Each structure stands twice: as structure tokens, then as C-alpha cells.
mmCIF file of C-alpha atoms and ligand atoms in Angstrom:
data_model
loop_
_atom_site.group_PDB
_atom_site.id
_atom_site.type_symbol
_atom_site.label_atom_id
_atom_site.label_comp_id
_atom_site.label_asym_id
_atom_site.label_seq_id
_atom_site.Cartn_x
_atom_site.Cartn_y
_atom_site.Cartn_z
ATOM 1 C CA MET A 1 0.000 0.000 0.000
ATOM 2 C CA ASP A 2 1.418 3.467 -0.918
ATOM 3 C CA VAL A 3 1.377 4.899 2.622
ATOM 4 C CA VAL A 4 2.630 8.334 3.636
ATOM 5 C CA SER A 5 2.390 11.160 6.180
ATOM 6 C CA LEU A 6 1.534 14.646 4.907
ATOM 7 C CA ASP A 7 1.104 18.027 6.543
ATOM 8 C CA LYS A 8 -1.132 19.452 3.871
ATOM 9 C CA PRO A 9 -1.976 18.720 0.248
ATOM 10 C CA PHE A 10 -0.766 20.734 -2.753
ATOM 11 C CA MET A 11 -3.530 23.347 -3.181
ATOM 12 C CA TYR A 12 -2.054 25.314 -6.096
ATOM 13 C CA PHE A 13 0.124 24.369 -9.092
ATOM 14 C CA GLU A 14 3.084 26.325 -7.752
ATOM 15 C CA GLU A 15 3.222 24.093 -4.686
ATOM 16 C CA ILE A 16 4.062 20.871 -6.553
ATOM 17 C CA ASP A 17 7.701 20.198 -5.558
ATOM 18 C CA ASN A 18 8.662 17.604 -8.141
ATOM 19 C CA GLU A 19 8.239 16.437 -11.726
ATOM 20 C CA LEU A 20 8.144 13.330 -13.870
ATOM 21 C CA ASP A 21 8.703 12.667 -17.544
ATOM 22 C CA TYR A 22 5.104 12.283 -18.725
ATOM 23 C CA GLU A 23 4.383 8.752 -19.905
ATOM 24 C CA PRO A 24 1.932 8.409 -22.841
ATOM 25 C CA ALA A 25 -9.610 7.938 -15.718
ATOM 26 C CA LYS A 26 -12.263 7.883 -12.984
ATOM 27 C CA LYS A 27 -13.093 5.715 -9.985
ATOM 28 C CA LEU A 28 -16.353 7.361 -8.802
ATOM 29 C CA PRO A 29 -19.767 7.940 -10.430
ATOM 30 C CA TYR A 30 -20.603 11.618 -11.172
ATOM 31 C CA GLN A 31 -16.940 12.330 -10.384
ATOM 32 C CA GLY A 32 -17.003 15.296 -12.771
ATOM 33 C CA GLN A 33 -19.840 17.109 -10.958
ATOM 34 C CA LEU A 34 -17.901 16.401 -7.748
ATOM 35 C CA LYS A 35 -14.648 17.830 -9.196
ATOM 36 C CA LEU A 36 -16.569 20.939 -10.304
ATOM 37 C CA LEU A 37 -18.610 21.324 -7.122
ATOM 38 C CA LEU A 38 -15.571 21.294 -4.835
ATOM 39 C CA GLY A 39 -13.577 23.839 -6.850
ATOM 40 C CA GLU A 40 -16.482 26.286 -7.304
ATOM 41 C CA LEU A 41 -17.552 25.966 -3.630
ATOM 42 C CA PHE A 42 -13.922 26.711 -2.741
ATOM 43 C CA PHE A 43 -13.764 29.753 -5.112
ATOM 44 C CA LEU A 44 -17.126 31.271 -4.067
ATOM 45 C CA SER A 45 -16.362 30.768 -0.333
ATOM 46 C CA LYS A 46 -13.234 32.867 -0.843
ATOM 47 C CA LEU A 47 -15.178 35.696 -2.469
ATOM 48 C CA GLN A 48 -17.600 35.581 0.478
ATOM 49 C CA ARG A 49 -14.627 35.872 2.836
ATOM 50 C CA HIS A 50 -13.638 39.009 0.911
ATOM 51 C CA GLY A 51 -17.140 40.488 1.011
ATOM 52 C CA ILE A 52 -17.525 40.497 -2.746
ATOM 53 C CA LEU A 53 -20.176 37.813 -3.203
ATOM 54 C CA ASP A 54 -23.361 39.300 -1.731
ATOM 55 C CA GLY A 55 -25.328 41.231 -4.291
ATOM 56 C CA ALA A 56 -23.287 40.006 -7.229
ATOM 57 C CA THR A 57 -24.567 38.351 -10.346
ATOM 58 C CA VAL A 58 -22.815 35.080 -11.078
ATOM 59 C CA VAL A 59 -22.416 34.626 -14.818
ATOM 60 C CA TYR A 60 -21.575 30.967 -15.462
ATOM 61 C CA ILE A 61 -20.776 30.335 -19.136
ATOM 62 C CA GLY A 62 -20.558 26.674 -20.216
ATOM 63 C CA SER A 63 -22.824 25.694 -17.290
ATOM 64 C CA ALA A 64 -24.828 22.750 -18.728
ATOM 65 C CA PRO A 65 -25.901 20.246 -17.516
ATOM 66 C CA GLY A 66 -24.898 21.879 -14.247
ATOM 67 C CA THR A 67 -26.388 19.372 -11.822
ATOM 68 C CA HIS A 68 -23.859 20.361 -9.131
ATOM 69 C CA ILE A 69 -24.756 24.071 -9.565
ATOM 70 C CA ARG A 70 -28.105 23.387 -7.853
ATOM 71 C CA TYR A 71 -26.148 22.435 -4.737
ATOM 72 C CA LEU A 72 -23.959 25.570 -4.910
ATOM 73 C CA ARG A 73 -27.056 27.731 -5.372
ATOM 74 C CA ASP A 74 -28.882 26.135 -2.396
ATOM 75 C CA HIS A 75 -25.799 26.402 -0.206
ATOM 76 C CA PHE A 76 -25.415 30.183 -0.565
ATOM 77 C CA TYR A 77 -29.164 30.774 -0.708
ATOM 78 C CA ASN A 78 -29.582 28.949 2.593
ATOM 79 C CA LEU A 79 -26.702 30.955 4.070
ATOM 80 C CA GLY A 80 -28.553 34.181 3.309
ATOM 81 C CA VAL A 81 -26.185 35.438 0.619
ATOM 82 C CA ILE A 82 -28.083 37.333 -2.097
ATOM 83 C CA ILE A 83 -26.800 36.195 -5.525
ATOM 84 C CA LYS A 84 -28.364 36.101 -8.968
ATOM 85 C CA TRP A 85 -27.248 33.230 -11.164
ATOM 86 C CA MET A 86 -27.078 33.583 -14.955
ATOM 87 C CA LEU A 87 -26.240 30.228 -16.531
ATOM 88 C CA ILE A 88 -25.529 30.438 -20.254
ATOM 89 C CA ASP A 89 -24.882 27.436 -22.497
ATOM 90 C CA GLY A 90 -26.108 26.209 -25.859
ATOM 91 C CA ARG A 91 -26.943 22.833 -24.230
ATOM 92 C CA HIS A 92 -29.826 22.359 -21.802
ATOM 93 C CA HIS A 93 -29.447 22.412 -18.060
ATOM 94 C CA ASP A 94 -30.511 19.779 -15.583
ATOM 95 C CA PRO A 95 -34.238 20.456 -14.888
ATOM 96 C CA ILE A 96 -33.485 20.708 -11.121
ATOM 97 C CA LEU A 97 -32.365 24.288 -11.857
ATOM 98 C CA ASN A 98 -35.719 25.284 -13.282
ATOM 99 C CA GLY A 99 -38.283 27.226 -11.282
ATOM 100 C CA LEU A 100 -35.971 29.379 -9.189
ATOM 101 C CA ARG A 101 -36.442 33.165 -9.438
ATOM 102 C CA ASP A 102 -32.778 33.778 -8.552
ATOM 103 C CA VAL A 103 -31.454 31.681 -11.427
ATOM 104 C CA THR A 104 -31.818 32.559 -15.052
ATOM 105 C CA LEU A 105 -30.968 29.920 -17.590
ATOM 106 C CA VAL A 106 -29.997 31.083 -21.071
ATOM 107 C CA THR A 107 -29.752 28.714 -24.069
ATOM 108 C CA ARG A 108 -27.125 30.565 -26.102
ATOM 109 C CA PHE A 109 -23.545 29.932 -27.093
ATOM 110 C CA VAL A 110 -21.980 33.288 -26.174
ATOM 111 C CA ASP A 111 -20.026 35.384 -28.669
ATOM 112 C CA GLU A 112 -18.295 38.728 -28.088
ATOM 113 C CA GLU A 113 -21.338 40.624 -29.401
ATOM 114 C CA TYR A 114 -23.615 38.834 -26.977
ATOM 115 C CA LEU A 115 -21.303 39.592 -24.071
ATOM 116 C CA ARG A 116 -21.817 43.281 -24.879
ATOM 117 C CA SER A 117 -25.612 43.009 -24.782
ATOM 118 C CA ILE A 118 -25.618 41.142 -21.477
ATOM 119 C CA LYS A 119 -23.127 43.614 -20.120
ATOM 120 C CA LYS A 120 -25.624 46.351 -21.094
ATOM 121 C CA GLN A 121 -28.454 44.315 -19.566
ATOM 122 C CA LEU A 122 -26.650 43.248 -16.337
ATOM 123 C CA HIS A 123 -25.604 46.856 -15.823
ATOM 124 C CA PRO A 124 -25.139 48.212 -13.181
ATOM 125 C CA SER A 125 -24.710 44.997 -11.176
ATOM 126 C CA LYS A 126 -21.294 43.584 -10.135
ATOM 127 C CA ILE A 127 -20.252 40.453 -12.005
ATOM 128 C CA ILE A 128 -18.513 37.237 -10.922
ATOM 129 C CA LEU A 129 -17.530 35.149 -13.925
ATOM 130 C CA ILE A 130 -17.241 31.371 -13.988
ATOM 131 C CA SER A 131 -16.203 29.785 -17.252
ATOM 132 C CA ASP A 132 -16.167 26.083 -18.106
ATOM 133 C CA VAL A 133 -16.669 26.242 -21.882
ATOM 134 C CA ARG A 134 -15.384 23.291 -23.943
ATOM 135 C CA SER A 135 -15.038 23.163 -27.743
ATOM 136 C CA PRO A 136 -9.270 18.944 -27.788
ATOM 137 C CA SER A 137 -6.653 20.356 -30.170
ATOM 138 C CA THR A 138 -4.161 23.033 -29.151
ATOM 139 C CA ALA A 139 -6.079 25.321 -31.528
ATOM 140 C CA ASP A 140 -9.366 24.500 -29.742
ATOM 141 C CA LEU A 141 -7.754 25.353 -26.434
ATOM 142 C CA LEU A 142 -6.264 28.694 -27.538
ATOM 143 C CA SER A 143 -9.607 29.699 -28.978
ATOM 144 C CA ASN A 144 -11.305 28.927 -25.609
ATOM 145 C CA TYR A 145 -8.683 30.902 -23.685
ATOM 146 C CA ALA A 146 -9.050 33.755 -26.174
ATOM 147 C CA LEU A 147 -12.839 33.788 -25.549
ATOM 148 C CA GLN A 148 -12.343 33.646 -21.780
ATOM 149 C CA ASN A 149 -10.172 36.809 -21.944
ATOM 150 C CA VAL A 150 -12.882 38.618 -23.966
ATOM 151 C CA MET A 151 -15.410 37.580 -21.279
ATOM 152 C CA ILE A 152 -13.341 39.427 -18.682
ATOM 153 C CA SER A 153 -12.676 42.529 -20.803
ATOM 154 C CA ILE A 154 -16.313 42.991 -21.800
ATOM 155 C CA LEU A 155 -18.045 41.775 -18.647
ATOM 156 C CA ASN A 156 -15.393 43.441 -16.546
ATOM 157 C CA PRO A 157 -16.080 41.236 -13.453
ATOM 158 C CA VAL A 158 -14.943 41.615 -9.857
ATOM 159 C CA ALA A 159 -13.515 38.056 -9.869
ATOM 160 C CA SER A 160 -13.272 35.059 -12.201
ATOM 161 C CA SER A 161 -12.860 31.270 -12.258
ATOM 162 C CA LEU A 162 -11.564 29.899 -15.537
ATOM 163 C CA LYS A 163 -10.984 26.382 -16.849
ATOM 164 C CA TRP A 164 -7.249 26.054 -17.456
ATOM 165 C CA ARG A 165 -5.137 23.283 -18.984
ATOM 166 C CA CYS A 166 -1.866 24.128 -20.680
ATOM 167 C CA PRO A 167 -1.518 22.651 -24.195
ATOM 168 C CA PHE A 168 0.998 19.820 -24.666
ATOM 169 C CA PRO A 169 4.532 21.029 -25.512
ATOM 170 C CA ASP A 170 4.786 18.563 -28.395
ATOM 171 C CA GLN A 171 1.650 20.191 -29.836
ATOM 172 C CA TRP A 172 2.677 23.806 -29.347
ATOM 173 C CA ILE A 173 1.227 26.441 -31.726
ATOM 174 C CA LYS A 174 2.151 29.773 -30.162
ATOM 175 C CA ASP A 175 2.716 31.623 -26.895
ATOM 176 C CA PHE A 176 -0.378 33.209 -25.344
ATOM 177 C CA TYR A 177 -1.574 35.231 -22.409
ATOM 178 C CA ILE A 178 -3.991 34.108 -19.702
ATOM 179 C CA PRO A 179 -5.227 36.199 -16.745
ATOM 180 C CA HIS A 180 -3.016 36.413 -13.745
ATOM 181 C CA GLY A 181 -4.514 34.340 -10.906
ATOM 182 C CA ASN A 182 -4.129 31.336 -8.593
ATOM 183 C CA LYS A 183 -3.790 27.923 -10.287
ATOM 184 C CA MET A 184 -6.142 25.925 -8.062
ATOM 185 C CA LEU A 185 -5.502 22.169 -8.111
ATOM 186 C CA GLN A 186 -8.597 19.907 -8.393
ATOM 187 C CA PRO A 187 -9.224 16.780 -6.258
ATOM 188 C CA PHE A 188 -11.230 14.028 -8.038
ATOM 189 C CA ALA A 189 -10.040 15.212 -11.450
ATOM 190 C CA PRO A 190 -9.459 12.337 -13.951
ATOM 191 C CA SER A 191 -6.496 10.083 -13.111
ATOM 192 C CA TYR A 192 -4.069 11.780 -15.473
ATOM 193 C CA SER A 193 -5.750 15.131 -15.966
ATOM 194 C CA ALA A 194 -3.536 18.254 -16.123
ATOM 195 C CA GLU A 195 -6.480 20.683 -15.682
ATOM 196 C CA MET A 196 -6.744 23.281 -12.947
ATOM 197 C CA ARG A 197 -8.900 26.370 -12.346
ATOM 198 C CA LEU A 198 -7.634 29.972 -12.632
ATOM 199 C CA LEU A 199 -9.096 32.161 -9.821
ATOM 200 C CA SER A 200 -8.717 35.965 -10.052
ATOM 201 C CA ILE A 201 -10.078 38.974 -8.167
ATOM 202 C CA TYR A 202 -9.977 42.272 -10.006
ATOM 203 C CA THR A 203 -8.821 45.473 -8.350
ATOM 204 C CA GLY A 204 -8.959 48.958 -9.844
ATOM 205 C CA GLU A 205 -9.535 49.120 -13.599
ATOM 206 C CA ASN A 206 -6.417 47.136 -14.493
ATOM 207 C CA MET A 207 -6.180 43.716 -16.080
ATOM 208 C CA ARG A 208 -2.906 41.841 -15.560
ATOM 209 C CA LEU A 209 -2.058 39.106 -18.057
ATOM 210 C CA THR A 210 0.746 36.536 -18.096
ATOM 211 C CA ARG A 211 2.483 34.946 -21.076
ATOM 212 C CA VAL A 212 2.667 31.179 -21.452
ATOM 213 C CA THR A 213 5.399 29.569 -23.526
ATOM 214 C CA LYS A 214 6.234 26.026 -24.625
ATOM 215 C CA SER A 215 8.847 25.686 -21.869
ATOM 216 C CA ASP A 216 6.068 26.481 -19.409
ATOM 217 C CA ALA A 217 4.079 23.787 -21.193
ATOM 218 C CA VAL A 218 6.869 21.272 -20.483
ATOM 219 C CA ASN A 219 6.860 22.260 -16.858
ATOM 220 C CA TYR A 220 3.050 21.949 -16.574
ATOM 221 C CA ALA A 221 3.216 18.435 -18.081
ATOM 222 C CA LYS A 222 6.004 17.090 -15.843
ATOM 223 C CA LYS A 223 4.666 18.539 -12.589
ATOM 224 C CA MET A 224 1.119 17.369 -13.331
ATOM 225 C CA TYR A 225 2.417 13.909 -14.225
ATOM 226 C CA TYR A 226 4.264 13.461 -10.936
ATOM 227 C CA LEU A 227 1.182 14.718 -9.038
ATOM 228 C CA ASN A 228 -1.106 12.211 -10.827
ATOM 229 C CA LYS A 229 1.271 9.271 -10.944
ATOM 230 C CA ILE A 230 2.819 9.569 -7.496
ATOM 231 C CA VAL A 231 1.005 11.985 -5.203
ATOM 232 C CA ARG A 232 -2.589 11.163 -5.872
ATOM 233 C CA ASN A 233 -1.752 7.506 -5.286
ATOM 234 C CA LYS A 234 -0.759 8.171 -1.654
ATOM 235 C CA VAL A 235 -2.605 6.869 1.429
ATOM 236 C CA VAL A 236 -2.147 9.593 4.073
ATOM 237 C CA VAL A 237 -1.870 7.385 7.184
ATOM 238 C CA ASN A 238 -1.682 10.373 9.451
ATOM 239 C CA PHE A 239 -5.073 11.595 8.032
ATOM 240 C CA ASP A 240 -7.616 10.395 10.595
ATOM 241 C CA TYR A 241 -10.586 10.203 8.316
ATOM 242 C CA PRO A 242 -12.963 7.484 7.009
ATOM 243 C CA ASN A 243 -11.033 7.628 3.734
ATOM 244 C CA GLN A 244 -7.304 8.257 3.677
ATOM 245 C CA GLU A 245 -6.628 8.383 -0.105
ATOM 246 C CA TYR A 246 -4.913 11.573 -1.212
ATOM 247 C CA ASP A 247 -8.028 13.039 -2.957
ATOM 248 C CA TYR A 248 -10.095 12.875 0.255
ATOM 249 C CA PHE A 249 -7.213 14.537 2.129
ATOM 250 C CA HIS A 250 -7.116 17.231 -0.598
ATOM 251 C CA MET A 251 -10.967 17.601 -0.499
ATOM 252 C CA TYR A 252 -10.912 18.007 3.308
ATOM 253 C CA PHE A 253 -8.750 21.124 2.862
ATOM 254 C CA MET A 254 -11.110 22.859 0.414
ATOM 255 C CA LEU A 255 -14.196 21.904 2.466
ATOM 256 C CA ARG A 256 -12.734 23.217 5.695
ATOM 257 C CA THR A 257 -12.950 26.770 4.166
ATOM 258 C CA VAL A 258 -16.720 26.533 3.560
ATOM 259 C CA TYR A 259 -19.231 28.420 5.744
ATOM 260 C CA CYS A 260 -22.163 26.560 7.371
ATOM 261 C CA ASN A 261 -25.134 27.703 9.466
ATOM 262 C CA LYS A 262 -24.797 24.620 11.675
ATOM 263 C CA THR A 263 -21.975 24.867 14.227
ATOM 264 C CA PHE A 264 -19.608 21.904 14.622
ATOM 265 C CA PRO A 265 -17.227 20.953 17.494
ATOM 266 C CA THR A 266 -14.374 20.233 15.080
ATOM 267 C CA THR A 267 -13.373 21.003 11.485
ATOM 268 C CA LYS A 268 -13.449 17.243 10.964
ATOM 269 C CA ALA A 269 -17.115 17.102 11.897
ATOM 270 C CA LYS A 270 -17.980 19.878 9.413
ATOM 271 C CA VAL A 271 -16.035 18.320 6.538
ATOM 272 C CA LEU A 272 -17.567 14.905 7.254
ATOM 273 C CA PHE A 273 -20.925 16.676 7.160
ATOM 274 C CA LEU A 274 -20.374 18.643 3.963
ATOM 275 C CA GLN A 275 -18.922 15.580 2.251
ATOM 276 C CA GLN A 276 -21.834 13.318 3.269
ATOM 277 C CA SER A 277 -24.081 16.107 2.138
ATOM 278 C CA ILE A 278 -22.260 16.463 -1.170
ATOM 279 C CA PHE A 279 -22.063 12.710 -1.924
ATOM 280 C CA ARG A 280 -25.708 12.135 -0.993
ATOM 281 C CA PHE A 281 -26.652 15.047 -3.302
ATOM 282 C CA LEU A 282 -24.560 13.639 -6.150
ATOM 283 C CA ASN A 283 -25.799 10.054 -5.426
ATOM 284 C CA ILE A 284 -22.251 8.829 -4.876
ATOM 285 C CA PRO A 285 -22.014 5.928 -2.344
HETATM 286 N N1 SAH B 301 -19.505 29.796 -26.499
HETATM 287 C C1 SAH B 301 -20.128 29.076 -25.564
HETATM 288 N N2 SAH B 301 -21.048 29.647 -24.743
HETATM 289 C C2 SAH B 301 -21.613 28.952 -23.801
HETATM 290 N N3 SAH B 301 -21.386 27.688 -23.540
HETATM 291 C C3 SAH B 301 -20.461 27.114 -24.382
HETATM 292 C C4 SAH B 301 -19.807 27.723 -25.388
HETATM 293 N N4 SAH B 301 -18.963 26.814 -26.074
HETATM 294 C C5 SAH B 301 -19.123 25.688 -25.470
HETATM 295 N N5 SAH B 301 -20.025 25.780 -24.416
HETATM 296 C C6 SAH B 301 -20.495 24.733 -23.473
HETATM 297 O O1 SAH B 301 -19.448 24.442 -22.580
HETATM 298 C C7 SAH B 301 -19.856 23.201 -21.955
HETATM 299 C C8 SAH B 301 -18.646 22.372 -21.576
HETATM 300 S S1 SAH B 301 -19.076 21.046 -20.408
HETATM 301 C C9 SAH B 301 -19.662 22.044 -18.998
HETATM 302 C C10 SAH B 301 -20.227 21.281 -17.796
HETATM 303 C C11 SAH B 301 -20.894 22.174 -16.743
HETATM 304 N N6 SAH B 301 -19.972 23.200 -16.277
HETATM 305 C C12 SAH B 301 -21.414 21.328 -15.579
HETATM 306 O O2 SAH B 301 -21.258 21.765 -14.425
HETATM 307 O O3 SAH B 301 -22.070 20.283 -15.823
HETATM 308 C C13 SAH B 301 -20.793 22.443 -22.933
HETATM 309 O O4 SAH B 301 -22.122 22.253 -22.267
HETATM 310 C C14 SAH B 301 -20.813 23.449 -24.121
HETATM 311 O O5 SAH B 301 -22.100 23.644 -24.742
#
């Protein structure tokens, strides 16, 4: 058994302290909704901590089916946070999202022109952007990242969460810029996934971008390979929890930052609660 003792999990890309030469997917049902729910609950909890969530309109682009979004919506709604949800996708959403006055579902694939009309329509509310659009090829990726930057420039949000996976070095097309932000690592991501989420909060009227080159691509690939191949396969023996696999240890850390109405005697009790709550909601054993 791959046993180990760990202080804390790697929460952001930058934390990974090792790499592996990438060698050329899921153990749980609804694992994808889980992966998404944890990251977005983590992101939104942070904004709440900063006082920038209440009264904002959450514009989620590439939100369908969005089964897990119902849970996120209920969570903040039950906490008393006032948020309007605007879920836009060309595909249809899970019907559990229907019939809620605080959530507007839009069946539209967004283009730059559309962003301008919704910006005019959302005005003067403050916007929190969440993007999970998916076309893939390096060209498909770049195009998605290009669109995500136009979302921020037009919508001009107070914070953003963007889907982010660096293209493979051996499939490099050109250097590009992505918004400056924290590269949040995702527990329960596919076995060999190199995807993370870019979380940014916008101050003043500036927009800081960062260039990404092929050498960065090589680094992303090796660090993400060691994390997937070695780290995620660890059994944290010093983690006193029903499940000691690395992903549960990693999940505990994101869930411990979440706010609940119900008071708990220990962080462990809360996490156990939120997790039970989350798994029951997702119908995961
Ligand atoms: N330009 C665009 N505007 C809106 N949605 C887009 C888009 N291009 C692709 N998409 C959508 O992006 C989605 C990627 S899968 C998204 C899953 C969703 N976040 C969930 O929680 O279940 C697809 O549903 C696709 O239709």
C-alpha cells in the first residue's frame, strides 16, 4: 500500500515540488460534478470571505448540464447570501435548476457581441464570472482561452474562475496570455488530468495578463504527471478520516474553508458533514 504522512496537500500548481517525464480515468460515479462542485464551492467561499459575493450576479458560461450548480445555489441561498445566477450554455441544463427566481438559464452559445448586450443588460450589477466552456486540439484550447479573456474585458467582473489546462509542448502552436490568478488544483479530477482552475479577483480598472510559452508547457506536463502518478496515489496514514486516499485529504482542505449555518465541534465534523451532504446530493455511495 502506498502509505505516507503529509502536513497538507498541494492546493495550487506552484506548490508541486517535483516532476516526472510524462508517460503516454475515474473511480467514482458523477466524479465530474464532484470535481466541479468542490472547486467552485472553494472559489465562491473565498469571495464571500472578501465580502464580494453578496449582491453580485454570477455569470456561469458553459454551465450545462450543471447538476452540481443546484447544490452551490442552495448552499449560498440557505446561508442568506443574495446572488443572482445567470447560466448560459447552448446545451440544456438539468431540470433541477428550473423554477428558481434567482437563477436565469440562457440557451445561447456566447459570442463577443452577446457579451456586450448582457453587459448592457446586467448593468449596473457587479459580475462574478465562472467559465467552463469546452469546444481537444491546441487550436481548440487557444480559442477557448481567447474567448475567456474577452469575457473578462467585456463583462469586466470583480472576480473570475476559468478552466485552465496548458496545451501539450509537443503540440505547441504559439505563446499566449492568460489572466493572472491562482492555479487551483482539483481533487477528483481524472487520473491523469492536467487541468486546474484559474481564480482571479480584479482590483482597480487594471487587467494583468501573463504569457505562457512552450517551456512552461513542459513544466506543466512534468509537474502534473508526478502529481497524478505519485502523489494522488498516496494513502495519508496520518489523516484520521474514514477515507485516507490523497483526494479525500485534498478535499478536506477545500471543504474546511466553507461556511455553514450549523456549528460543529471540530473542522473534521464539518467536513464529514459537507462531504456526506455532497455525496448524498450527487448520489455517490
Ligand atoms: N460559447 C459558448 N457559450 C456557452 N457555452 C459554451 C460555449 N462553447 C461551449 N459551451 C459549453 O461548454 C460546456 C462544456 S461542459 C460544462 C459542464 C458544466 N460546467 C457542468 O457543471 O455540468 C458544454 O455544455 C458546451 O455547450
